[PDB]
Amino acid sequence: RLIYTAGGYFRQSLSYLEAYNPSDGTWLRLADLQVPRSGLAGCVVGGLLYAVGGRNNSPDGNTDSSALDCYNPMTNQWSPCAPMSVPRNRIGVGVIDGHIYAVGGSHGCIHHNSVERYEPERDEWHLVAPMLTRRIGVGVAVLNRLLYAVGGFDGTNRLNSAECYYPERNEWRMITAMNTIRSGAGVCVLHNCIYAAGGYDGQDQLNSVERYDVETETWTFVAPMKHRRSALGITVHQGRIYVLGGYDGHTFLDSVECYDPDTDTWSEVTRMTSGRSGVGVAVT
Numbered sequence: 001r002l003i004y005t006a007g008g009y010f011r012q013s014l015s016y017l018e019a020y021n022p023s024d025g026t027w028l029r030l031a032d033l034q035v036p037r038s039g040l041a042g043c044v045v046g047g048l049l050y051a052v053g054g055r056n057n058s059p060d061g062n063t064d065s066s067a068l069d070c071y072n073p074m075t076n077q078w079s080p081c082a083p084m085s086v087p088r089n090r091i092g093v094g095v096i097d098g099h100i101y102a103v104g105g106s107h108g109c110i111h112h113n114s115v116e117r118y119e120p121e122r123d124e125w126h127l128v129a130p131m132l133t134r135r136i137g138v139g140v141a142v143l144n145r146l147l148y149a150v151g152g153f154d155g156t157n158r159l160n161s162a163e164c165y166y167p168e169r170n171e172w173r174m175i176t177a178m179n180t181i182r183s184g185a186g187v188c189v190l191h192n193c194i195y196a197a198g199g200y201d202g203q204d205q206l207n208s209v210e211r212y213d214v215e216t217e218t219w220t221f222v223a224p225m226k227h228r229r230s231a232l233g234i235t236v237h238q239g240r241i242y243v244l245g246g247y248d249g250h251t252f253l254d255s256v257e258c259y260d261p262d263t264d265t266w267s268e269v270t271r272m273t274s275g276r277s278g279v280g281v282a283v284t
């Protein structure tokens with residue numbers, strides 16, 4: 001399985017789709033997105049890569065995207081799907097039982113607290129219960145068939161709070177807040193724990209990383225990354241966390257760090273073909 005990185009931003013929204021093979025250390029250049037996208041989120045359902053939301057910030061215009069596009073690795077083709085009810089720039093995405101949940105995001109200056117769910121076998125979006133907080137740049141993690149939305153930006157303050165969505169009950173419940181305010185951080189699930197890495201606390205870009213244990217209801221710092229990163233791509237591949245690119249306050253990073261939970265260590269493993277931030281990343 002490969003680590004796919006779709007879109008991104010560097011002076012403008014990008015159309016790149018590249019894939020990393022963690023065993024051979026090789027990079028693949030695949031079919032470009034039809035529309036350049038930054039601030040999107042990626043996910044995989046049924047071996048198909050999906051690109052949700054974001055926007056195309058160009059030197060000629062700026063349009064937030066309600067689009068859903070699905071890349072087929074066997075055909076190397078992007079195909080458009082049913083758009084969402086609203087444009088969702090800086091979106092969070094999670095997958096439960098084959099359904100793509102789209103969390104928060106912004107449309108111009110409107111910061112969403114609404115959530116919609118996509119059925120791939122019917123090409124249809126449907127609104128579910130809205131979150132208790134408006135969140136853009138929110139991280140999303142699926143654990144125990146529950147959906148966790150972590151941090152983000154509510155329109156006035158960057159958030160350290162987090163809430164949990166219960167699909168069978170269609171309700172949100174606030175959980176323990178993190179130790180650090182994080183917007184545009186990398187949120188993933190590794191070994192029954194929710195990891196949150198990097199982000200932006202309103203003043204600086206962070207290198208700190210904390211993980212949440214569902215049963216202790218406590219956030220715990222772990223070893224920090226070698227680079228400060230915000231708006232980074234994150235995913236899990238064979239028991240290790242990979243973070244890609246991001247913004248460090250000066251440069252757009254091309255570094256790719258790898259976190260091993262057994263030794264609690266971050267190690268640079270590769271570099272992308274160019275620096276970028278706000279990418280959509282998924283594994284298939």
Ligand SMILES: CCn1nnc2c(C)c([C@@H](CC(=O)O)c3ccc4c(c3)CN(C(=O)c3ccccc3)CC4)ccc21
Binds near residue numbers: 137185199200277278
């Ligand atoms: C500049 C200070 N700075 N440094 N870090 C910042 C972050 C994370 C944000 C948030 C918004 C906010 O928290 O109000 C935010 C969250 C998600 C996305 C973007 C921005 C825009 N994203 C970009 O590609 C991008 C481009 C350039 C720089 C950073 C990110 C992708 C998606 C804003 C401001 C921040």
